Amino acid sequence: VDQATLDKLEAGFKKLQEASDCKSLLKKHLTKDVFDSIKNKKTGMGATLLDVIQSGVENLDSGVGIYAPDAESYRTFGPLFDPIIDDYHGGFKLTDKHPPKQWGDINTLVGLDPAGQFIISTRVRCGRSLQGYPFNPCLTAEQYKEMEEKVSSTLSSMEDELKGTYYPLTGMSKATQQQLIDDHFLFKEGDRFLQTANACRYWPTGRGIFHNDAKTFLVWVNEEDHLRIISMQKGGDLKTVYKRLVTAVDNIESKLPFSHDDRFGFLTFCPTNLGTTMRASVHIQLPKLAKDRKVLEDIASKFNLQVRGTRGEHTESEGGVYDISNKRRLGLTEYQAVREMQDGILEMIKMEKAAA
Ligand SMILES: Nc1ncnc2c1ncn2[C@@H]1O[C@H](COP(=O)(O)OP(=O)(O)O)[C@@H](O)[C@H]1O
Ligand SMILES: NC(=[NH2+])NCCC[C@H](N)C(=O)O
Numbered sequence: 001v002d003q004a005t006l007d008k009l010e011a012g013f014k015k016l017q018e019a020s021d022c023k024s025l026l027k028k029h030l031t032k033d034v035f036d037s038i039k040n041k042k043t044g045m046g047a048t049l050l051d052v053i054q055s056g057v058e059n060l061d062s063g064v065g066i067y068a069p070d071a072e073s074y075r076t077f078g079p080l081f082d083p084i085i086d087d088y089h090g091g092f093k094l095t096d097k098h099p100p101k102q103w104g105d106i107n108t109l110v111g112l113d114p115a116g117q118f119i120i121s122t123r124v125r126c127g128r129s130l131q132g133y134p135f136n137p138c139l140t141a142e143q144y145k146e147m148e149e150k151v152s153s154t155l156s157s158m159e160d161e162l163k164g165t166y167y168p169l170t171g172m173s174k175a176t177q178q179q180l181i182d183d184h185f186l187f188k189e190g191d192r193f194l195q196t197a198n199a200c201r202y203w204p205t206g207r208g209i210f211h212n213d214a215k216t217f218l219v220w221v222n223e224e225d226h227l228r229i230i231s232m233q234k235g236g237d238l239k240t241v242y243k244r245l246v247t248a249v250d251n252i253e254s255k256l257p258f259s260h261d262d263r264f265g266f267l268t269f270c271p272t273n274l275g276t277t278m279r280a281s282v283h284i285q286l287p288k289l290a291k292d293r294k295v296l297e298d299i300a301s302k303f304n305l306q307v308r309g310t311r312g313e314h315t316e317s318e319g320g321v322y323d324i325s326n327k328r329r330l331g332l333t334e335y336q337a338v339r340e341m342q343d344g345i346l347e348m349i350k351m352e353k354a355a356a
């Protein structure tokens with residue numbers, strides 16, 4: 001590694017040490033030993049530790065703070081990734097390997113809120129990376145364009161419920177983009193954590209969204225991951241939402257080669273998204289449990305759930321609507337991940353009904 005990058009690394013390490021109230025997993029796990037062990041390393045694509053940690057150095061409010069510029073980085077900088085992955089995912093040892101893909105028995109999934117008084121909408125997403133393309137910080141503009149063509153052409157073959165249209169972000173009207181984001185379908189533009197990871201270069205080239213006309217099946221192209229594959233609808237019918245996601249992911253996988261790792265399962269740009277890559281969520285109102293929000297977050301954590309705002313992570317709740325989802329994605333099957341959301345949300349609703 002070049003001196004300028006080493007210099008920047010020493011200054012970032014210092015900045016993290018000095019930030020007394022920073023609570024990122026980067027600060028917690030980047031010890032002097034770990035840092036010295038990997039700061040002179042570089043991947044075959046030229047990714048350095050600075051590329052890995054810069055977002056967490058610049059955004060001290062990060063919860064995690066690191067990303068992988070390429071797949072190799074997960075091992076080149078293993079002494080930092082491994083403890084962070086073990087911490088975030090609630091246990092994932094050096095000797096552990098993510099299990100084979102296993103959607104489970106869908107008929108064991110239920111309707112999460114039959115009377116309809118708490119849950120607004122239910123969503124399940126996965127992420128996938130295309131074999132032969134590195135993650136965002138290592139992509140060229142031309143590669144973004146190649147990937148967009150490949151994914152949009154593949155999605156032109158979706159049929160029946162999943163048939164839909166690709167809408168590139170380049171050329172999309174501001175009004176349409178804002179409506180799709182306000183309606184919770186399209187990814188936000190301008191995320192500071194992704195920007196400082198150099199994940200948004202050449203924006204909006206190569207970025208876009210595919211969706212069926214009802215907007216119950218969507219695919220994001222070239223946001224944080226090469227693909228995010230999404231099923232969602234109003235209400236609490238997790239069984240329906242999940243079955244549509246399964247159908248779509250199995251069909252897309254038969255067509256496009258995605259990166260999968262013996263230890264980490266499906267590869268993604270952030271270590272929180274490895275393994276199953278799955279985030280199953282509800283938009284839910286729980287006014288009594290959320291009155292003291294520390295009670296909401298504490299309750300959620302005991303069910304291995306995460307609370308996000310209405311417009312996603314790093315946002316506030318609006319009108320009492322919280323996004324609550326499984327936090328863990330690696331070291332448990334797809335079935336186990338969606339069941340952590342189902343089981344936890346059914347109990348939070350029971351607790352809300354029982355609360356004073
Ligand atoms: N259950 C849900 N219902 C409706 N919209 C949802 C739901 N869960 C998440 N969203 C939306 O998903 C978008 C992405 O939020 P984000 O927190 O970045 O999640 P991810 O990237 O994991 O999909 C936002 O527009 C957010 O409002
Ligand atoms: N979209 C994500 N990968 N979210 C989890 C990480 C987000 C951000 N890098 C942080 O450390 O808080």
Ligand SMILES: [Mg+2]
Nearest residue numbers: 187224312313
């Ligand atoms: Mg996101």
